[PDB]
Structure formats: C-alpha cells, structure tokens
Amino acid sequence: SHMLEDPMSFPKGFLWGAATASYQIEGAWNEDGKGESIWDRFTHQKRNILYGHNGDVACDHYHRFEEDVSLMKELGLKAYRFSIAWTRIFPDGFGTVNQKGLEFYDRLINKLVENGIEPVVTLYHWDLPQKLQDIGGWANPEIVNYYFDYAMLVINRYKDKVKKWITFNEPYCIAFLGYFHGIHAPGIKDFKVAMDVVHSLMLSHFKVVKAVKENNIDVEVGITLNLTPVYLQTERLGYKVSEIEREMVSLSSQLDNQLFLDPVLKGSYPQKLLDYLVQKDLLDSQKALSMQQEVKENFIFPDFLGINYYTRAVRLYDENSSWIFPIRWEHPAGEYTEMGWEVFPQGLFDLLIWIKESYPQIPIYITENGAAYNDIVTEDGKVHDSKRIEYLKQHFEAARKAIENGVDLRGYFVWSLMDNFEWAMGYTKRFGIIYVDYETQKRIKKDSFYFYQQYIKENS
Amino acid sequence: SFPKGFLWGAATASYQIEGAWNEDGKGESIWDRFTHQKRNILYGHNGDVACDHYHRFEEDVSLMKELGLKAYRFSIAWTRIFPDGFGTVNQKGLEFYDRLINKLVENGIEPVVTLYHWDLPQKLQDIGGWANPEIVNYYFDYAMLVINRYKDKVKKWITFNEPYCIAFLGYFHGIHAPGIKDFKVAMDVVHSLMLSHFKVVKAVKENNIDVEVGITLNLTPVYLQTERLGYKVSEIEREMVSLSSQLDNQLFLDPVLKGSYPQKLLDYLVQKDLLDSQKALSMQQEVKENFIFPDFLGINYYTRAVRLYDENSSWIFPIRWEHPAGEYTEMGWEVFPQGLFDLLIWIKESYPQIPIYITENGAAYNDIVTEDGKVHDSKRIEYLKQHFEAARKAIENGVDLRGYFVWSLMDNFEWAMGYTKRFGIIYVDYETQKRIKKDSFYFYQQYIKENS
Ligand SMILES: [Cl-]
C-alpha cells in the first residue's frame, strides 16, 4: 500500500574528495628555504616516533605532486583537501615571506584547478614553526596574531581559486596530544597549558572568520573537529544507568566534542565541563571566567563545520580511574582496525543526527573518514584491501542515511588519498586508497581506489 | 582425526558457578571477602548466588549428558571441605562433591578436578595466604584428602589453575583476590605455588596412586609487530620482548617441565630491584631440589599478544602492545586461532614430550536471548569452530593433544568483570536461574558426535 520511494541521492555538487596534510606527505623538509616546524623538531629527537620514522621524505609529494594530481583526476575526485605548511611561507613564523613556498602552492592549486578538482585548504594541520614554539607556541597570546597574518596572506593570495578554508584541523589533538599527553609535537605535558592552547585556537579561528566576514571576502570558512560519539556500556548490558554515571560519562564526552563544538557554533564553552575542571584544580577559576567571556565577545558563526569521524567510544563510570574523569573505556566485540579502533558506521549516522538536533543549522563536510589495514602488495602489483572497501562502503551508506534524515551534508573526504606518515605511529599505519612503496615512492592503486572511483561515478 | 577417546569437555570453576557462599558451614574465601568490598568488581557484582550450581547441579549434569561431553572440568572449593583452611573437615562439603562426582560417573562423564581455582580460605589469607611458606603444607593436606577420597572415579587432577593470575593479578596488580599490590610478594607466591604443585605430584608418584596429576597454565603466544610490518628486528627488541614473554609463559612452564625458572628473567628482575638476589638463588635451588615431571600439561588459550620495544613504557619491561586489525571479543581479545596452533607446536618443540589438554578455550560475546527463547551466538560458533580446527591441525602435526575443554559450560561470574562477560555455551538468566542452550551448544553437540 506504499508506492516505491527512490533511494536518497547525494545532492548535486556533493564534494567527493580525499584528504592529506602537509607534514604527512610533502617531505622536502628543509628545501627551498622552508623553516623547521615543531614536527621536524619532534621527529628528529629520539623516542618520539615508532621506529624512529620521520617526515623528511614522507610521500615526496613536494616533488611528485603532478603525478598525485593525475591520480586524483583518474579517481574522479570533485575536491582535494590538503594543508599549507606555514614554514614554507614564513620560515620563522613571521617576517620575510618565502617566495619559493608560495610558488609551490601556486603550482599545486593551479594544477588542481586545471584538472577540475576543487581545492579545499586546511590552514593549520599541526606544523607550527619551531621559531614560534621557541617563544611559547600556542600558549603565547601573540600566536593568535602571527597565525592571523599567515592565514590572511594565503587566503588573499588564493581566494580566486580556493573557496573553502579550514582554520584548524583537530584542535583536541593540537591542545591535548601536543601539550598535555605530549605524544604529539611539541611534546609538552601540562593540562593547564593545554587549556590555554584550546583558547588560543578558538580565538585564532574567530579572528579569521571575522576578517573574512567583515571584509566581505567571497570564500567560506570553517573548522575541522574530530568527534567521537560516546555510548554507555551500562546500556549495552541492559542495566539501569545511575545519575552519577550519566553525569560523569557526559562530562568526559564534553572534553572530546562540546569543548570545541560549543564555542564554534554557539559562542560559549560547555559550562558544566569548565566548572568540573575548576572544581578539580585542573583549570584556574580566573581562566575559566576569562576564556568564557572572551569567547562570548569574539564569537562569530562559521560557514561550515568539518567533521573527522573514525570510531566511537564505549565508557563506564569507575571511581578507580586514573583519568581526569572517573571513567574507563570498554571493548565491544566486533571488527577493529590497525589503530585498535572499532568499525562502527552507526556512530557516523548517530553523530550527524546529534549535530543536526543539538546545534544551529550549518552545512557539514566529513573532512576525514577512513581505515588502517596492514596492506600487502601481491606478486602482480595489486592490493586487495577488501576490509577497507567494506569500511568505506558502510560509512558512505551511513552518510546517505544522514542525508535522507535531513542532515545538510555537502561533502565527504576519504582519509587518505595515499599512505603517509601517521604522526607518532610513523609509517606503520596505512590509510591510503593508494599504496606508497616508501623504498621506491611508487604509487600503487589499491582495490579501494577503484571501488571509490566507481562509487563517485554512481553518486554524482 | 581426533584420537579415539579424545576428551571433549567443558569447564567451570567453583566460585564462578556454585553460589551457596555461606551455606552448610562453608568457610569464607578470599573471593567472598573481595566481592564483599566496594570498588573491586564491576557493578558491585558478587558470587553469593552465581549460577546456584550447588543447588542446581543435577540439571547441569543432565545438560552435560544432552551435550554428549566426554569429560567435565570443575574445581573443588577448599572452604567447603576445610572452612578454616585446616583442622576440622566439613562433611556437608564432602557430601556435595560426592553427589556431583557420582552423578557425572552415572552419566558416563569423566570428572576432571582442579584442586585450586583461586578460592583460598580467608582464614589462611589472614596468616599471609600464599606468601606464608606453611601454605604449601595446608594445601598439600587438603589436596591429598580429596585425591584419596575420589581417586576411584577421578583420574585426572589439576593442582592449580593459572598461577600467573593467582600471583600477579592477586598479589601485584591487586585486581583479583586478595587484592595485594607488591611485586616481590607476587614472586614469593609464584614459588609457593610451584612447591605446592611438586609436593602433590611427588606424593602421588611416591605412593603409586593410579591417577594423573598436572597443572593448568594460561599461555599467551607473543608476536612482534616489527615482523608484521616486514621490518628488520633489532637484537635489543628481540631481547626485551622475549623477556616480557617469559613472565607470561616460561616462568611457569620451565619449573613445571624442566625443573628450573628462566634464568634470564630472574636476572632481569634482580637487576630492576623487582626480586632480591638471595631469593632468585634460593628459588632456583628449591625448584631443582623438588622438581618432578607431571603426567600432563593443561593449557588455557584465548588469544595472542602483539608487542614491540618501547623505552617509554610504564610496564616492568620496556614494551608496548599493538592492536592488529581483526575480530575482537567483549574482553578486547583478538580472535586468533593460529595462536593456538603455533603455541602447541612450540610446546612440542621446546619441552619434553608430555600429554596436553586444552583446559580452557572460549569467547565472550554480548549475548541476547531472542523473544523465541534462543541465543543466536554465531560469532561464538565461528570462534570455537576455528579453534577446534587449529587443535586438529596440531594433532595432525604430531602434538600429543588428548582433550579440549570449552570455557564455559555456562555463563558465570567473570571475576573482576562480574556477570558482564558471558562465556557459556548455555545462557544463564540470573533473575530466574533458567538455563538456555545457545546455538553454540548444538554446534558443539554436533561437533563432538562427528569427531568421536
Ligand atoms: Cl576580496
């Protein structure tokens, strides 16, 4: 008694893309006058990266970008997300502009446009100039202005061709992995410093959004957040959830998600979380107060939200925990990647519905999604990455379902176009749809490349 | 094929299933104590009732017969026999195990008894537990009483289940009873367990008692991440990861089968101030003096470990664990049947010839009872099928494997995880004590029939 409803289509113009970051692919770490970044410094020290790997060569993309753009054209990408290395432009962070750095991004952007691929630029993907770290890095309030001057130089240079700009990639990682856990550059280990960095990143973001809007620059500006939907083990077990468990697991999830979403989309930090941190002597009251006032004063709503989604977390209340919240993580049965991350496409759907229901209307791009498997090249030069294909297929379909349920999703960027340097894990994690043989720098298209090629064709 | 008479079984432990924790004069155990304190067990679960097997054992044996088990591995609760650890023997406790063993025999199921599966009398912990040298004698007297009582019907005896856990989880990590946190004490416990084991083996052999005695070890085969990635392995990584694996495996296998502890491990622990030099010396001397080879080795196998060298590690060895892609259970354990084959081959290659029993293997999945009263545990079936096939392959390659006990006959109290982990081929509804056969029960029923 119900006439067939057609499948929900991806909308016309949907940006099917792939994503990379400068330090992870470019190599050429000291070439053409490029300054030292915090990642150059970090990987050149012992005991920071698995196997002593570094990004000195990486995928050699600074040299091989033309081949890579040819592969993007073959794939049929609508868009390519990449980051600009600040140290190629301003080797010391500020001062004299390095013309050879501008010439590289000129050539890359021109090549993308020549090939009909929309460039999407991340301004900051973790590679702060070491000379700025020498004066405190993101903890130094003057950083906001140095970042702003860099960002506006490149926006003004490339705005004719680059219409979508991402201020920051994954500020959770920049702040907490870089300045609390110290497992990312610059390797600092101080929670209060990390919260200072959170705030610098938010003010930096707003300053760029404000300049773009006030000067009526015809580009869109957003920010990319890694979001982790949180589920209760107690509910998986079918038990009754206590008030204290709900509250503590909620607060723990606010550190991951709302700490960044709320300032960006609502103009305040999540007050219950700041209160908790003050009450636990993890954040000074005076700082909690000033950071809340400064976000209120400087808030401006952005043009889009970028989401990086890989997995979920399952948590429960545990007074014995050593974490900054009394929680532990549990291990639902299922399929896991080489990162030890659960394959959970339902989490992408749930997260997108939650954004739609909990925040003001805004265009959403999935700026990263992908999986690491231990790829083997066959004798006949193939990579039969069937599990990566299954992962992508299921997440693409979760995105379609989100669109069917009214989420304003406007693009989807697979992490990554090519295997690359995975930060403190070195080259040991391969996320590409293209395999890179690091001995030869040969690009080998994986089965997932051909899968995605056909998926784009069928969904555009 | 599986050899004629291969012991297809299932396994339980007393604290995990029995309940009746304070009935019929039973003494308090360290697990009664541990679960009665706050913040030791998920959700504040305890073993006070568990699966109520003390009361419902007749139903359970009927299910074992329906299943077609050749053997049933269970543990005896020391506190039901000697409530105070030594002294007065409790006749009601003996009566229970009499009834259980008689019922197993009546049904044609071979009883296989674990003498100690973690439930030390609290009165013995009160005088230092496994750290008190006199524990060897208290254990010995308990063990010989029950061996002599049941040797007409029970022909396979396991001195200890998982000494790694008894010592390190109970006395170093303190996440198992009795909740102590002292590495040097844990090493004293290791040694007490080894001497206890040898004293029972010696008495059985010296008195010519016609039963077989062994011990059950949880073994974790280790794999290098470096080799998974195809990189060259450094000598230092090989050395450090090897040491880390000796704590899991050789620390227990070497005394039991070769009459020494792994010297390289003891030397490392002494260097790191985790073992006193004089203790390392006396340990080796005493194991040499008391060593006697057992009748069989029990292995508990669930998963492997993938490790790599990392000087930044907080562990007692400079290693970290990696997470290979694949299927994982509710314990966070990789499904890795190749590990069972590799482990068995390694035992054959590395140790003197000895009969092996897999005394535990199984998996935890978040089972749902459907509205039609079934449990469609397809992943548990796939887990078991693959591990059975690994065991078959081991036999085909010359390993003297003589039986295989699925952990567990029924869902039960999983120690510090409480009832949140279900390992059974039979589901237990803890509200009603209903036993519900899972799909894995019928899979196994059919597998036994086809492989016997
Ligand atoms: Cl303009």
Author numbering:
A (entry chain A): -6 to 453
B (entry chain B): 2 to 453
Structure paper excerpt:
Bgl1 catalyses the final step of in the decomposition of cellulose, an unbranched glucose polymer that has attracted the attention of researchers in recent years as it is the most abundant renewable source of reduced carbon in the biosphere. Bgl1 is a member of glycosyl hydrolase family 1 (GH1 superfamily, EC 3.2.1.21) and the results showed that the 3D structure of Bgl1 follows the overall architecture of the GH1 family, with a classical (β/α)8 TIM-barrel fold. Bgl1 has a half-life of 250 h at 60°C and it has been shown to be a thermostable enzyme with a broad substrate specificity and saccharification ability that efficiently hydrolyses cellooligosaccharides to glucose. The catalytic site residues of the enzyme are two glutamic acid residues, Glu163 and Glu361, as in other enzymes that belong to the same family.
Here, we report the three-dimensional structures of Bgl1 from the thermophilic bacterium C. saccharolyticus and its complex with glucose, which is the product of its catalytic action when lactose is used as a substrate, that were determined at 1.47 and 1.95 Å resolution, respectively. The Bgl1 crystals grew in the monoclinic space group P21with two molecules per asymmetric unit. Comparison of the two monomers in each individual structure showed that they have negligible differences, with an r.m.s.d. on Cα atoms or secondary-structure elements of 0.16 Å for Bgl1. In the case of Bgl1, sufficient electron density to accommodate a glycerol (GOL) molecule and an ethylene glycol (EDO) molecule was observed at the active site of the enzyme and both were added to the model, which was then subjected to refinement. Both molecules form hydrogen bonds and van der Waals interactions with the catalytic residues Glu361 and Glu163, respectively, and mimic the binding mode of the substrate. An additional glycerol molecule is bound at the interface of the first monomer (chain A) with a symmetry-related molecule of the second monomer (chain B; symmetry operator −x, y + 1/2, −z). The 2Fobs − Fcalc and Fobs − Fcalc electron-density maps also revealed the binding of polyethylene glycol (PEG) molecules that lie on the surface of the Bgl1 structure in those areas which are most exposed to the solvent and are not involved in symmetry-related packing interactions.
